Paper text:
KDM4 (JMJD2) is a conserved iron (II)-dependent jumonji-domain demethylase subfamily that is essential during development. From our biochemical and structural profiling, we find KDM4A, KDM4B and KDM4C DTDs display different histone-binding preferences. We show that these DTDs use an aromatic cage as a general mechanism to coordinate trimethyl lysine and, most importantly, the sequence specificity is largely determined by side-chain interactions with surrounding residues.
In dramatic contrast to KDM4A-DTD and KDM4C-DTD, KDM4B-DTD only displayed striking specificity for H3K23me3 (Kd=10.3 μM), with no significant binding to H3K4me3. As KDM4B-DTD also interacts with H3K23me3 with high discrimination, we investigated whether KDM4B-DTD engages H3K23me3 using intermolecular interactions similar to KDM4A-DTD. Analysis of the KDM4B-DTD structure reveals a highly similar overall tertiary structure when compared with KDM4A-DTD and KDM4C-DTD. To pinpoint the residues that account for the poor H3K4me3 affinity of KDM4B, we looked for apparent clashes or missing molecular interactions in the modelled KDM4B-H3K4me3 structure. Indeed, with the N960A variant, H3K4me3 binding was rescued to Kd=303 μM, whereas the corresponding substitutions in KDM4A (N940A) dramatically decreased H3K4me3 binding, most probably due to disrupting the hydrogen bond with H3T3. Similar models of KDM4C-DTD with H3K4me3 and H3K23me3 suggests general conserved interactions as with KDM4A-DTD, except for the H3R26 clash in KDM4C-H3K23me3 model, which might explain KDM4C's lower affinity to H3K23me3. Together, these results suggest that despite overall sequence and structure homology, specific differences of key residues result in unique H3K23me3 specificity of KDM4B-DTD.
Numbering used by the authors:
A (entry chain B), B (entry chain A): 918 to 1026
Amino acid sequence: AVSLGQVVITKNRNGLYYRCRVIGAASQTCYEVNFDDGSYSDNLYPESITSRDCVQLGPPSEGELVELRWTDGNLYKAKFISSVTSHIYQVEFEDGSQLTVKRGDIFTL
Amino acid sequence: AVSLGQVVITKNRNGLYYRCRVIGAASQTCYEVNFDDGSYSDNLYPESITSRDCVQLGPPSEGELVELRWTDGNLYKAKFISSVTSHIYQVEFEDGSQLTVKRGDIFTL
C-alpha cells in the first residue's frame, strides 16, 4: 500500500537512513525459465514467450515446456518455472537526491 | 490513494470504460509553454526543453524563451509559462493494451 507523495524511510546513496518522498512506482512481472544448457533466466519479460500469449492469458503451467525469444533475437525452448511480480519505487530525499528502491528496502509508518 | 496492482476503471482509446490494472505511477513535472501562434501546452516534460538541460538546473525562468522538441519531432521556440507536479498513472487493460492516465480520469472502487 505504498503511494505517491508518501514519506518513507530508506537507505541513502551513502547507505544511511533518511526520510524521503515516493515520486515514482512501477510493477514488473518476470518469468523464471530453465534452459536445456543447464542455465536459467529470471528476468524474462512475459511478452518473450512465443508459444503462449501470456500478456493476455497469463503465465504458463508450472513445468510447462515453452518457446521464447531470447536476448539473442532468436527462439529457444525452455521449462517455465515461476512467475514473480515486483514493486519498485522512486524516492526523493530532502537532498534533492533520488534513488530507485525495491519495495523490500522501504520502511513505512 | 492509488496503488500498484489496484483495479480501477478508465477510458480506453475506444472512449469506452473498462477495468484496468495500475502498473505504474509517477509524480511528474509538467511545463506550460506558449507558442507563437497563440497556442499552449501543459503536459510538456522537462527533458523536451532543448535550449536548457532542465533535468538538472530545474525549470527555466518564467516567461523565458526556450527551444523545445514537440510531438512531431521538430524543434520550436516557445515561452515557458509555469511548472506543475501531476500524478500520472500507467494502466493495463485485459487487452494487454496500456494507457498513461491523469489521476483525475480514474474511477476507483
